[PDB]
Amino acid sequence: MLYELIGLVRITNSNAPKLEAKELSSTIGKLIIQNRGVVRDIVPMGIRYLPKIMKKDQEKHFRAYHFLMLFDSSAAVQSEILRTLKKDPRVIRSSIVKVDLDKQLDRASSLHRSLGKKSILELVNEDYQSI
Amino acid sequence: MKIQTNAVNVLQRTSAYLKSGLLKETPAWYNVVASIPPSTKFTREPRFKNPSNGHIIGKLVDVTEQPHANNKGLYKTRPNSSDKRVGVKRLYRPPKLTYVEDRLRSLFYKQHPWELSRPKILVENEIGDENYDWSHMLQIGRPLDGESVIQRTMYLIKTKQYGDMVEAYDHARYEFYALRMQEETEQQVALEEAEMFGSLFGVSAIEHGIQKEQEVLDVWEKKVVEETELMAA
Amino acid sequence: MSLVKLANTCAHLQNCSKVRVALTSIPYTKLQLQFAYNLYQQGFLSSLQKGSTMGPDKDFVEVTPDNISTRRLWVGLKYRDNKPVLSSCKLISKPNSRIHLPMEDMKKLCSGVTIRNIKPLQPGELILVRAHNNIMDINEAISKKLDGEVLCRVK
RNA sequence: AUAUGAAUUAAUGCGAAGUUGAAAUACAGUUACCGUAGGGGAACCUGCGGUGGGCUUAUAAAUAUCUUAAAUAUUCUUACA
RNA sequence: UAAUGGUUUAAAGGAUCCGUAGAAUGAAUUAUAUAUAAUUUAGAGUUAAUAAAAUAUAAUUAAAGAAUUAUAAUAGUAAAGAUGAAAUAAUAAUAAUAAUUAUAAGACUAAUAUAUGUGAAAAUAUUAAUUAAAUAUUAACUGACAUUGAGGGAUUAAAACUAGAGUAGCGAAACGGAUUCGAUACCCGUGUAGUUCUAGUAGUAAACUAUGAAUACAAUUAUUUAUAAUAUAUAUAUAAAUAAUAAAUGAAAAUGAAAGUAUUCCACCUGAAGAGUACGUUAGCAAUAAUGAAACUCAAAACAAUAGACGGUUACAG
RNA sequence: UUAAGAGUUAAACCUAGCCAACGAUCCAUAAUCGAUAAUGAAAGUUAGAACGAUCACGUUGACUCUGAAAUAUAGUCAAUA
RNA sequence: UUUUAUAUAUAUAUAAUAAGGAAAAGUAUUUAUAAGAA
Ligand SMILES: [Mg+2]
Ligand SMILES: [Mg+2]
Ligand SMILES: [Mg+2]
Ligand SMILES: [Mg+2]
Ligand SMILES: [Mg+2]
Ligand SMILES: [Mg+2]
Ligand SMILES: [Mg+2]
Ligand SMILES: [Mg+2]
Ligand SMILES: [Mg+2]
Ligand SMILES: [Mg+2]
Ligand SMILES: [Mg+2]
Ligand SMILES: [Mg+2]
Ligand SMILES: [Mg+2]
Ligand SMILES: [Mg+2]
Ligand SMILES: [Mg+2]
Ligand SMILES: [Mg+2]
Ligand SMILES: [Mg+2]
Ligand SMILES: [Mg+2]
Ligand SMILES: [Mg+2]
Ligand SMILES: [Mg+2]
Ligand SMILES: [Mg+2]
Ligand SMILES: [Mg+2]
Ligand SMILES: [Mg+2]
Ligand SMILES: [Mg+2]
Ligand SMILES: [Mg+2]
Ligand SMILES: [Mg+2]
Ligand SMILES: [Mg+2]
Ligand SMILES: [Mg+2]
Ligand SMILES: [Mg+2]
Ligand SMILES: [Mg+2]
Ligand SMILES: [Mg+2]
Ligand SMILES: [Mg+2]
Ligand SMILES: [Mg+2]
Ligand SMILES: [Mg+2]
Ligand SMILES: [Mg+2]
Ligand SMILES: [Mg+2]
């Protein structure tokens, strides 16, 4: 099953905001691949101020590095990934949504699909792809 | 309303009145209405053919009529859902009338929007009196309009001088352009000749428009100054 | 031989007479065809035609299992003197209560005597009877000395 | 068990002229009723949900334009075209 | 001496569906004696392919949010709170109310929003996920396998009860303050059960569309809603929802694709009150739920509509 | 055992059956019916006096002889008077 | 409609052509029977 995860990672080091997002992406991707999964795409959304001063545990966050991960995997390890995300202090907010594959095997992320690129083949364009 | 009995059976009621003796003198209309029976059937009549295009209503093509496959490559072996539905409403609806010209006309005034500005008269004169040969566009007793172009297109296609709709339409269009250029030149040259020979014109179209604009603008001046004074306070 | 279908046809003909349609379609079966033919012989119907679900048959079509589902019998109704010729069409023998009369009871019914709560035959009325899978008028079934099922009334 | 009677005792019906509450019928002056719970002698009061057999009883934030006004349309009686 | 009766409103559609029997009903063609047999696909189904958010419904799990209450701190001052107006044994000088923060608690889900829809009904609209079910068309297949359904089975709002936990708001009962001739009521304060979750009992609602289910047919218009096309335009065609109607029906109001024309099955009704009462029986922990009379009294009783009067009934004018 | 079948009765041995919400079992009531009487247009409804057919009884219960056939208005025994 | 022609690749597009007209005078028993009112 294709699952789109949208994580809101906290920024604590003002000099290298991307480090914590890198560590989180590494962890989630490692879990997905080591539990018979596939990581179709990692779209690096930028740094954005949160709509409100959202609170996780005791720390209060005003901005976050947003990031997206499209990955094909099973339901059980998907729930495991969600559980790990929820208890992790690094992830302010997390959300996993199914992307249906009933009709087309390959589908892009919500962002590219909204732009107009239905599939990842269109994302990487089509030359010598008729082989 | 229910189909009314009393309106058409006036003769029968009057006959009963007369024979009973209730009425002594026959009405003047009695013999006439007896000679001319009123039509006493009010029935919805089935329609099997659309007159405008000749499409036949109420025909189903049976499975046997197709011994070959269709576009998708499938033989028709059993009737489908739409074929197994009674279509009496199709018979009893008034058929929509469709004509080929209606398309070309829509094209023409799309291609030449300013031809619409040329006024048209819908009062019919006499339709039966029309005696037109459409080997040429101009007809006596007719204006030169886009409908002439569509009529020439249909004449061209009917005689098979040209094969496709587009070709005949283009040929008629070019004849139309030539004729309209000739008329425009006549108008311009006629006005120039009139001015050449001493004709004096009281008012022209530009000055007429300017005059109307002036009246409207004066009223607008009064209203705007008054409204500015009103709004300021 | 569905009496349910004959009831449906009767109601359909009544409804068509009310709205005064000149043509209507009924299911194409032996019972319905015989019933329509009997009505037509008495003058209650203007014409019988064989056709599809869409309309009458433009050319003669043989009836086979391939097209049996889409076959229909088109009847032309009559409206004379601003009145429908075929005004009311009802069932005597209903599916819940089926009435099979012997010949003498059929004569008694024609002769003004109520039999098994059936109103006696009226002067300008027609009662149809089924005997040996053949539909006929009550008078013929009496003349044929055939005991039969008393189906419907057409007045 | 089928009956016949019984101290004691549960409810309900009628009527004579009256007596008391103001609960319902109008927005019945706390919208009524349905189910349920409690309070109260009772009528009824209150909480909870439902129904309309009450709100369909519904009724503006407004502005308007150009072709021969006539020796020509208006006049026309089966004509002429 | 009226059932050649009815059940939206006069008496009467079961809360909903599933399904057993039915000595209930039921497709087409041919042959044989009222059926049996063989064939067939129009009902009813099965499997795929395509299209669509099959998003809505059920259970479970994981989350979000505005606010409320309480406590604590900060400053700051004299009042605050409620009502028609007030006053309350437990607001405030023990620094209250209000403001700004910081903690914990439960419950609930604003806009979208029309319950449009989904669900058999009851119900259901904060988000995400797991599973289950629900749509239309085409193709293939079975070949009447269907409809309804006594008894029975399952689910069933709110209230209620049985165990545990929970208890921020609201709030029966109770305790007080007001109003009043009286207050046992409406208004006000504190507020117990309950409302909440889990595991159960029970199976009642104006459980309503006061309208059981299925099938054939029935004249229009207008919108949407959902598909299929054809090139925004065909005011495009096919369906269903909604609104107003024609005919028809009806005591009328009104219904209007059913309250119409017909067929099949089931449930229910036979004047008002006594009475959904008593007694008995069945089930439940109980409250209660189901089944359910009779005597006596009377010529009454009710529905729709009409014209009036009346309203602490509206608006318009003078 | 009977002229004769059958849990009709008596004895023996096996099986687990039989009826029932289309109403068993139990209780109350009742002689049944007609080409008889009444009534109604009729379907039906009521009566079962009178005419006729069948059954049962001759104060109550059981048994026995005779007989083709009787639990006889017989006999025996008991109950009641 | 039907048949045929020309053209084009057994079929397709255009054009022409249509057989359904017949006459004549005279030749009862109906059935069974349902009423409301204050
Ligand atoms: Mg009152
Ligand atoms: Mg009140
Ligand atoms: Mg109180
Ligand atoms: Mg409800
Ligand atoms: Mg009211
Ligand atoms: Mg109303
Ligand atoms: Mg009667
Ligand atoms: Mg009622
Ligand atoms: Mg209902
Ligand atoms: Mg909402
Ligand atoms: Mg069912
Ligand atoms: Mg609710
Ligand atoms: Mg508890
Ligand atoms: Mg609480
Ligand atoms: Mg409170
Ligand atoms: Mg009061
Ligand atoms: Mg209070
Ligand atoms: Mg509760
Ligand atoms: Mg339960
Ligand atoms: Mg109750
Ligand atoms: Mg009930
Ligand atoms: Mg009800
Ligand atoms: Mg009615
Ligand atoms: Mg009870
Ligand atoms: Mg034996
Ligand atoms: Mg025995
Ligand atoms: Mg024995
Ligand atoms: Mg019994
Ligand atoms: Mg006796
Ligand atoms: Mg006796
Ligand atoms: Mg006698
Ligand atoms: Mg008797
Ligand atoms: Mg005597
Ligand atoms: Mg004796
Ligand atoms: Mg004796
Ligand atoms: Mg004696």
| DSSP string covering C95-145 | SSS--EE-HHHHHHHHTT--BTTBPPPPTT-EEEEEETTEEEEHHHHHHTT
Q: Which nucleotides of D are covered by protein (CB under 7 A)?
A: 66-67
- From B101, B122, B108, B106, select the one nearest B180 (Cα to Cα): B108
How many other CB atoms sit within 10 Å of the CB of residue A10?
A: 22
Asked if residue C103 and residue C74 are part of one domain, the reply reads no
DSSP, residue by residue, chain B = -PPPSTTTTHHHHHHHHHHHTS--S--HHHHHHHHSPPP----BPP--B-TTT-PBSS----STT--SB-TTS-B--S--TGGGS--HHHHHSPPPP--SHHHHHHHHHHH-GGGGGS------S-STT----TTSS--TTS---HHHHHHHHHHHHHHTSSSSHHHHHHHHHHHHHHHHHHHHHHHHHHHHHHHHTT---S--HHHHHHHHHHHHHHHHHHHHHHHHHHHH-
Last residue of one domain, picked from the residues C86, C113, C132: C86
- B114: nearest Cα among B91, B82, B146: B146
Q: How far is CA C70 from CA B173, C36, C77, in A?
A: 50, 18, 22
The CA-CA-CA angle for residues B53, B57, B58, to 5°, reads: 165
CB A32 within 8 A of CB A38: yes
Q: Are residues C79 and C109 in the same domain?
A: no
Closest CA to C84 of C72, C75, C94: C75
Q: Per CATH, which fold does A2-124 belong to?
A: Alpha-Beta Plaits (3.30.70)
Amino acid at B141: G
Return the structure tokens found at C49: 């035609």
Domain that holds residue C154: 87-155
Q: Are residues C127 and C146 both part of a single domain?
A: yes
Alpha-carbon distance of A28 to A5, in angstroms, equals: 10
Report the C-alpha gap between A85 and A58 in whole angstroms.
Answer: 17
Spell out the domain ranges in chain A: 2-124
Gap from CA of A59 to ligand 30 centroid (Å) = 105
Of C51, C86, C121, which marks where a domain is finished?
C86
What is the rounded CA–CA span in Å between residue C149 and residue C97? 11
For residue B60, give the nearest of C20, C52, C82 by CB distance. Answer: C52
How far is the C-alpha of B152 from the C-alpha of B130, rounded, in Å? 15
What residues 62-91 of chain B have any CB closer than 8 A to a CB of chain C?
62-64, 78-79, 83-88, 90-91
Reduced to 3 states (helix: H, G, I; strand: E, B; else coil), residue A112 is: helix
**Whether residues C61 and C42 fall in one domain:** yes
Residues A70 and A40 sit within 8 Å (Cβ to Cβ): yes
Is some CB atom of chain C closer than 8 A to the CB atom of B12?
no
- Residues in Cβ contact with C38 at an 8 Å cutoff, skipping those fewer than 6 apart: C126, C128, C135, C136, C137
Rounded Cα distance, A9 and A21, in Å: 6
Cβ A105 vs Cβ A35: under 8 Å:
no
Rounded distance in angstroms from the CA atom of residue A58 to the C1' atom of nucleotide E79: 39
Cite residues whose beta carbon is less than 7 Å from strand D: B 205, 208-209, 212
One domain, residues C77 and C3: yes
Domain count, chain C: 2
From the candidates B12, B86, B90, which should be mutated to test the interface with C, based on the most C CB atoms within 10 A? B86
CA distance B101 to B108: 10
* Helix or strand run (H / E) with residue A51: strand A47-56
Nearest to C83 by CA among C39, C20, C36, C25: C20
One domain for residues C47 and C77:
yes
Can chain C be said to touch chain B, i.e. do they have 3 or more Cβ pairs within 8 angstroms? yes
Q: What is the DSSP letter of C69?
A: G
Same domain, C27 and C73: yes
C117 with C127, same domain? yes
Q: What is the CA radius of gyration of chain C?
A: 16
Q: Which helix H or strand E contains A123, and what residues bound it?
A: helix A120-123
Task: Report the Cα C41 to chain-centroid distance in Å.
Answer: 11
Distance CA(B143)–CA(B137), nearest Å, equals: 10
B57 Cα: distance to centroid of ligand 21 (angstroms): 56
Residue C21: its chain B contacts at CB < 8 A?
43-44, 46, 88, 92
Q: Please state, in angstroms and rounded to a whole number, the distance separating the CA atoms of residues A62 and B109.
A: 61
In 3D space, the residue among A82, A58, A74 whose CA is nearest the CA of residue A6 turns out to be: A82
| Neighboring chains of A (3 or more beta-carbon pairs < 8 A) | none
Q: Which two tokens stand for residue B198?
A: 């001493």
Q: Whose CA is closest to A104, among A118, A92, A84?
A: A118
DSSP helix, strand, coil percent of chain C (3-state; round to 5): 30, 30, 40
For B84, the closest of C25, C58, C70 (CB atoms) is C70
* Separation CA B218–CA C78 (nearest Å): 74
**Cα(A96)–Cα(A109) distance, integer angstroms:** 12
Q: Which residues of C touch B87 (CB under 8 A)?
A: 53-55
Nearest Cα residue to C10 out of C24, B171, B227: C24
Q: B60 Cβ partners below 8 Å, 6+ apart?
A: B83, C52, C53, C54, C55, C70
Measured on CA atoms in the order B80, B82, B86, B88, is the torsion positive or negative?
Answer: negative
| Helix A18-34 and helix A75-87, axial crossing angle in degrees, nearest 10 | 150
* Number of Cβ within a 10 Å radius of residue A81: 23
Look at the block and give the residue holding tokens 């009064």.
B222
Q: Tokens 């031809």 map to which residue?
A: B115
Report whether B104 contacts B165 (CB < 8 A). Answer: yes
Task: Give the 3-state secondary structure of residue C6.
Answer: helix
Whole-angstrom distance, CA of residue B150 vs CA of residue B112: 13
Q: How far is C77 from chain B (nearest CA, A)?
A: 10
Residue with tokens 């480090």: A19
Give CA separation, B83 vs B229, C44, C49, C55, in Å: 74, 30, 19, 12
Which of C86, C121, C137 is the C-terminal boundary of a domain?
C86
Nucleotide nearest to C16 (CA to C1'): E218
> Do C47 and C112 belong to one domain?
no
- C112: alpha, beta or left, given left = phi > 0 and alpha = psi -120 to 50? left
Report chain B residues whose CB lies below 8 A from the CB of C22: 43-46
